[PDB]
């Protein structure tokens, strides 16, 4: 394997011009068990090489699409020309309970629809008028955010002044976010910018307000955006264990929940990449500890429940074992049915910043093997965590190019690929079962015990589907 | 919980009692939600004429637009040329969105590259990105042509595309003869269809501006066809089918029907089909050039008339009966070919369908939206069917276009209750379907949220959506459909009358209450 | 009452309070109606396993059959021949029904005559009816051929068609050379499809039995195609289109596509197109003969093999992927033509659509009915899509057929929960969809009353109908659709996945209740 | 347009026929003059169809099962014979009803004995007795069974009367044998008569010795309205607004108990004279119940009918009559004001069954239209007598018109509108002539009464003035 994989890497890189080749070589590696510091074998979080068809998005995607957009009782302005908010309207399944257009607004597209006059004269006057119109037509909104698209910073607009002046005039929370897509190298910096905006404009609102009645079992789910209901199928287990989930950041999340989070006893971080910033802040400022957990598959979910329960007292640890015993027969039935139908099959993954490592356990619980994985925008601390999860001599790729991904697949010949919408139809035409591992292919949830059953059903229906035997015409 | 033999996805899993109780406690404990009576009161208010008037007073806020930005149309245009890679000079997040948007509508791969300009380029420009970008793209994906557009960042900082490309060639990053047409495509100007026009004109000028001395109008005995921004595969195919039936020589300029429909046969084909570079080079020698969607091909029109010296016919989009007739008669006049018996029979078969279905169509009231040419053709055909297009919304329409539609409406009694709206969005349209309720909506997938809103007021107030347009994301394979020509008119008619009859069956399905009218024969 | 600017038809007129009160007074005063609680009790009972067992013990009673009588298929077969008038020897009431039945499905004229045998002829026979009927028919409607079948009165009394026709010629009522093929078509034997087989075999015999000596198998290098009972225009067209694409010389024997689709251009055309007499005369010179629907062409097959000496290929109906593949391969072997790139690509586009839609189709449960060849092809394709055809009902199927379908089911994991029913009707099927609820029905318009019944039990028990088959009376222009070949599989695939997605949108449209799953993108 | 024009037209069309057919068809074609008032002096009717000429008629089974018995909603009707007849006639006729279908009402269902060849050889009487028991097991709330004989029953010597008598007594159930075999008679008409006699013999006298019904002076029955698209409901509402009590509707939305109650009424109101005059004459002779013909097509006829009916009762009914007329006056006046300008002067040709070819003329004239030709599938001479008082001078009359004849008449007369059946609709649309179905109302209606007139006018207008009709000729042809 290892020898064939390194030869594969070099063969693929022969197509590139010299400069691209030297760069891309640094972003491709073969896992070596005795190397635990990812900073010794792969680099990450660097700019993409021009013209190589990166799969990455921008800092607006990471801020508006990922972190802020799911907050359900606020109105989020895509501030700029019309494109960015339209392409990202309801493309991500960050699920919520609400009355859309009345008290919740997640799947709507609010925009300032910049025209050339707004480029010439600036958009700050238009933004102030926009805020007034929002207030007239959507009176039950509990806050506004301003998600900056590329032109805002380039033309010298001052959305922070508009938000300060209009926030005070109207007694409204108005959050300026400088998530312009030219910033950073990917979605990742949008996460950081968005975290800092929550910190600066939202999170210190109830700093010294103490009317909320706390309990020793108060927690927050940090970094779960409720894709297909993922956060709900996690919350139910935590509360069956006796905990009180005060807040969900930010799937199905309300602004009030976020504002209450400085009052909890423990921050439970699922997506480290996107929310470690605010978690570190809440530990520094409020003394709240935070821990990483994993609700993909029975093995990781059981391990997480026990680790979380160990932070509290014997009553929670008792209820923890009660939950594990309740769901034992259910997920054992899922394994008994689907593991035989999936065992031995080899999987290549390519996703964003967490799942390329976080779902490996769930695959292994069905006897499958992850032979390659990679991230669009992960950092080296992510890759450190990945090496512990991935097998010996497996292929690792950072900001993989379209050409690289195709050539790796043609040689490795995985039984299943798990990636995104821009990848799905390429590999299906090559006759390779594909599951979307961002959108869950409009299925899910995949988190928790209830989510594992759907995950197994989904991997099985696709991998073993009759369509894959039919690619070849009997006459060729 | 789950039953292994009957696994539940999110629907209906979260309707289980334990999930319902969990969600109620989340709401009551930490969401500080408005009381339900207050939600109901505000919702009721959003359905009123009073709300509609405040809604139409908006100047700065846009809500649920029905348009996209220029580079999306430039990408689609470029995809229609042989072995051509769309290339958007600017920031990479845009290209992720363009590809994903088309991915979901066509359920196909969509190839497009960026040169990944960052904050640093805002100070020294994107020249180096272009040099390495063109070299990296050509070597890696081996296109025969790279068609360059821009994101809004590149437009604001002012990158000179022409110069950057010339210097990329001069400095050796790509061969001098490698075709690199370009167009500036600012998102704060016009919409996605403008990007199509700009890209096409850029490609037309690249291949013909400096070579006109050679050309003689009509010398290749063909008719150029420019389709515009077109997201139905059947519309490219029907035009080529009709012209071939007529024995008319033609060149379809920008033809993506092959690359948006490759077979699943074990290999991925990044490129397939498309207009050749030779067809663009030779296009000035055509008899004439026909624009299928003239209301977003104005720049292209000025170039074909100013430089190729073609006398572009005054034709509407070939939608419906009258305008397909006019299209074929003008093609006959230009080409000297008679309209053949096959097309005359097909026409009469469409007319037969109209006579057969007119009693269920008559008087039916519709709200509809889309791009200007598509909308006006839909209006025209609806009037021909005895239907009333009461709310006509074109977010990216203009005054001159609205005048042309108002004149079409004024020529028919079925336009008597219709209003044309420009610059309004689907939040405007939501109000109209509440205050002046139609029978159906004809629009893209964003209309599903309007139908949901109307049902919440009451089943008697629900306005069902009929999906025709772009993007359609929540049904599979409607992108294979046709809307142009007699074929497309036949498909639209069938969809409309059967949507009407589906709804009537629903309303008469109640045993002993309304099923006296649940007729077997309709 | 009526408001002139908003006139109400029966629905919703009779929902007005004054009509409601009137209807309540009619019931309570004079209808002596069973009390509603008793009606509810009986309805529930009709949805139980107990009722189903009594239902399936029926021996003499048939309720809501899924078949018609032989002459219906003899008429459709006869309509497929050039300037041919179908002529049913017997009682005229039959012909009114045959014509109206096809009228409502095709929304087209349907020409057919009777010779109006009455009480008189029931004793002394209908010889005089035949003499005057043939002379009257030829003089008045100027057919080139009259194809003769029988109603059940003519079968019971025993009229000898052969003798009556020969005596009509002997005594000068019609010219000796005028073609008058015939077949006996007793309604108490088989079903409508049996009449098609009988009529076709009769026409084949008339034109070839006594001329075989100069025939040489293969001398005309063509392949004969016999379509059988076929009520989708697209199915005739897709077969001719695929063979034309392959370069295969062929003769479609019984081709009504033109006479079932004449244009509305100001004149009525009683006849149009059709298989020519010379084509039938020349058919023994074909390389071979292919039966598109072999399970109701058994009599034709005996004659083609026994007299023409063709070796009919063992081919299933070309529905779905595998069976279209097998059809084209066999045609390629017989004719020596290769399968062209165009058909290979079409195949790969169908497979692409299968990969795109498999996640919503997988595991979906269906009840379906129709004629035997159509049903088994629908079953085969559903298995290819990962769907489970749980209730398979063929009223006019036989034991040998049910064995073949049971073998198809056994060869796939998606047949594990399926059952094939023969000789059962749609009242049997109603019980199955209650006791073993599927997700959808695939069937003809008579299924709409089953959907009505299931909804009355509860929205959660409703089984929506997907209309594929014959007759379809309550939607417009579905008779133009296609079910054969890759094109037909593509149409069926689209209809099914979008019926699934339509229903999911309905179940997730409830605001703040189920619309968490009302996804824009599916 | 002129008489001489039409007479030459008739002769021209008949040139195509063989000698025997020519002579017969000439007797069923006439041009009426207001001077001859005895239809027996100018047109022949209710004769056999000539073979091979594509008559539009049906059979006695259609007239019995499809027309009279089928609509009775709480009985189960067996199509006894092979499978064809009941399938083609399942739910083809829009005889509307209120019920729970499959438990207490059964109109749109198709029950059949599905004869096989064994049933031809041994007879079907044993199968019919078994079928009756299966019906009782599976449809316990049915209130009676009818046996609609198809062609083979009488031909093979079956005795359905014996079966109905035995099983009916065994089960204490009304089981009605009906000998409506399709070879009987010459058309649907004899099916009506056979069906009327079957009602009389097996149903109508059930309560002859019963005195528990609470009669009033205003009890009436609607005879011969089959509630097409709700026609009978939009009639019934007016009669009861006028102060009458409608005890029964024969047979649209009709129950068997309504039928059994009808001998207790004061007046039988006959709409369809053709199909129900037989039972109406019987009820006058046996029970002394008078009957009268009326017409609810259009405001002119409906007003005339309400007043004539009201005149059979006392001043209180006559007062409510004018209250009803006054209530609805502004409504139908608004309909004429909107639609008569859009239809005035347009010429109509009709071909229907046994009543509507004359009964709808008044409603067309209320919209300013002219009926220039009309005819019946199966009318008798007393119908044609009534037709001459409705039709204009020199208009064309055709009895049992052939397909060829109808086409050629239309080509020459060039009417603006044709009103006929489903077998005719698509022929004339292709010729560019607006067509309205005047049996099924083209899945619209009701057309009876004041509420029906609004829909009638809307429907004639939408089709006559539709934009499709100016598009048949391609601009290059
Ligand atoms: S936030 Fe991130 S790309 Fe952690 S930007 Fe992305 S809904 Fe991915 S791997 Mo889409 S760091 Fe969430 C993600 Fe992971 S949008 Fe979703 S699937 S767990
Ligand atoms: S019963 Fe007769 S053919 Fe009087 S058999 Fe026929 S529902 Fe006609 S002209 Mo169809 S004598 Fe009724 C009739 Fe008239 S079925 Fe209907 S329209 S008023
Ligand atoms: S005149 Fe009338 S409709 Fe004709 S049969 Fe006779 S009762 Fe019936 Fe029935 S089954 Fe088929 S359609 Fe006929 S051939 Fe026998």
Tab-separated table of C-alpha atoms in Angstrom, chain A residues 421 425 429, chain B residues 72 76 79 98-110 229-234 236 256-257 259-262 469-473 475-481, chain C residues 352-353 356:
chain	number	residue	atom	x	y	z
A	421	UNK	CA	-22.702	18.081	-4.182
A	425	UNK	CA	-22.375	13.240	-10.005
A	429	UNK	CA	-20.958	8.301	-13.635
B	72	UNK	CA	-23.727	32.518	-13.229
B	76	UNK	CA	-23.597	28.678	-18.406
B	79	UNK	CA	-20.235	25.635	-20.870
B	98	UNK	CA	-22.176	28.667	-9.206
B	99	UNK	CA	-21.282	24.985	-9.538
B	100	UNK	CA	-23.488	23.890	-6.631
B	101	UNK	CA	-26.426	25.916	-7.964
B	102	UNK	CA	-26.247	24.276	-11.377
B	103	UNK	CA	-25.359	20.866	-9.829
B	104	UNK	CA	-28.686	20.788	-7.992
B	105	UNK	CA	-30.816	21.840	-10.992
B	106	UNK	CA	-29.247	19.583	-13.645
B	107	UNK	CA	-28.109	16.778	-11.275
B	108	UNK	CA	-24.885	16.727	-13.288
B	109	UNK	CA	-21.251	17.725	-12.789
B	110	UNK	CA	-20.506	21.376	-13.496
B	229	UNK	CA	-29.605	31.643	-20.691
B	230	UNK	CA	-31.402	28.308	-21.092
B	231	UNK	CA	-31.744	25.599	-18.433
B	232	UNK	CA	-34.097	23.126	-20.177
B	233	UNK	CA	-32.258	20.497	-22.244
B	234	UNK	CA	-35.357	19.999	-24.388
B	236	UNK	CA	-31.791	23.233	-27.177
B	256	UNK	CA	-24.507	22.818	-23.625
B	257	UNK	CA	-27.048	20.022	-24.098
B	259	UNK	CA	-22.182	18.340	-21.368
B	260	UNK	CA	-25.250	18.688	-19.123
B	261	UNK	CA	-26.439	15.166	-19.977
B	262	UNK	CA	-23.523	12.753	-20.274
B	469	UNK	CA	-38.528	27.813	-14.669
B	470	UNK	CA	-35.182	27.952	-12.918
B	471	UNK	CA	-34.050	26.686	-10.456
B	472	UNK	CA	-36.088	23.539	-9.846
B	473	UNK	CA	-34.380	21.728	-6.967
B	475	UNK	CA	-38.202	17.537	-8.162
B	476	UNK	CA	-36.041	15.240	-10.278
B	477	UNK	CA	-35.308	15.538	-14.020
B	478	UNK	CA	-37.691	18.341	-14.977
B	479	UNK	CA	-34.596	19.926	-16.556
B	480	UNK	CA	-35.104	17.410	-19.398
B	481	UNK	CA	-38.402	19.114	-20.302
C	352	UNK	CA	-27.680	8.146	-14.936
C	353	UNK	CA	-31.242	9.043	-13.937
C	356	UNK	CA	-29.609	10.282	-9.457
